Amino acid sequence: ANATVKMGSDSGALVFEPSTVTIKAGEEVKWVNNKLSPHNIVFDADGVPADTAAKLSHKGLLFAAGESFTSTFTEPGTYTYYCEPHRGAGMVGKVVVE
Amino acid sequence: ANATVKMGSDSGALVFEPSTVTIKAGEEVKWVNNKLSPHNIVFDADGVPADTAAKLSHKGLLFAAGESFTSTFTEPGTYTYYCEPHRGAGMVGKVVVE
Ligand SMILES: [Cu+2]
Ligand SMILES: [Cu+2]
């Protein structure tokens, strides 16, 4: 089903919650800015086509709570991503499209 | 309701079809690359906050048919936009959020 991922947990941690989501090809994932802004979504290119990873990324930073970004995943695969400003804190995620 | 806008008409014209869509605040619009690529979505900032217009834009160019971009409009207003490479051809659109 379509998935919603919180950027910054309710418990106040620099994480994507849930960190791993599984969807069906053709579905979308919406990231909603929650706590400890700012955040962004950058997909790494290992295991998936470099250009697809780029098209799925949203490099602009989100500041206000409730702001969101949506990406539609039409091709099956394992897409790992991260929040640039919080990479050191380990704010990483994964989307499995089947 | 959620709206889908074709970038490049079935009749083979450099236009957004439908050029004007009306949605309810909170809903989203999905632009799907159809014909005469490439295309992108850039919202102009007159009548709406400059930063909101930027957050709604998708500057990257789409080439393959079926590729898409999604933007969620949570704030009411009239958002006019255009396709950068086809501005001269008059490829412009409008989203009315109520
Ligand atoms: Cu972050
Ligand atoms: Cu165009």
Side-chain angles (χ1 to χ4, degrees):
Chain A
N2 289 332
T4 298
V5 184
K6 312 173 202 166
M7 294 193 286
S9 66
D10 287 332
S11 53
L14 289 176
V15 300
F16 284 106
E17 178 61 54
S19 51
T20 300
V21 292
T22 303
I23 56 171
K24 287 197 271 287
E27 297 186 318
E28 61 193 66
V29 177
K30 183 164 82 165
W31 288 272
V32 187
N33 196 25
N34 189 37
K35 280 185 177 183
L36 296 173
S37 307
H39 306 284
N40 73 351
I41 304 90
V42 174
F43 283 86
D44 48 61
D46 78 298
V48 294
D51 280 14
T52 306
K55 285 184 285 278
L56 293 168
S57 303
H58 294 270
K59 287 187 179 289
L61 296 178
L62 290 185
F63 295 81
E67 289 183 315
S68 65
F69 276 137
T70 304
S71 286
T72 302
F73 297 69
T74 64
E75 193 73 34
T78 299
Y79 304 72
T80 51
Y81 64 97
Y82 60 85
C83 175
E84 288 186 324
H86 299 133
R87 191 178 193 163
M91 192 171 179
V92 296
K94 172 174 170 174
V95 180
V96 175
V97 188
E98 304 198 309
Chain B
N2 289 332
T4 298
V5 184
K6 312 173 202 166
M7 294 193 286
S9 66
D10 287 332
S11 53
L14 289 176
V15 300
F16 284 106
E17 178 61 54
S19 51
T20 300
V21 292
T22 303
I23 56 171
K24 287 197 271 287
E27 297 186 318
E28 61 193 66
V29 177
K30 183 164 82 165
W31 288 272
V32 187
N33 196 25
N34 189 37
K35 280 185 177 183
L36 296 173
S37 307
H39 306 284
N40 73 351
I41 304 90
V42 174
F43 283 86
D44 48 61
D46 78 298
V48 294
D51 280 14
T52 306
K55 285 184 285 278
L56 293 168
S57 303
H58 294 270
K59 287 187 179 289
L61 296 178
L62 290 185
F63 295 81
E67 289 183 315
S68 65
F69 276 137
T70 304
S71 286
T72 302
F73 297 69
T74 64
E75 193 73 34
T78 299
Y79 304 72
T80 51
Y81 64 97
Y82 60 85
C83 175
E84 288 186 324
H86 299 133
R87 191 178 193 163
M91 192 171 179
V92 296
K94 172 174 170 174
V95 180
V96 175
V97 188
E98 304 199 309

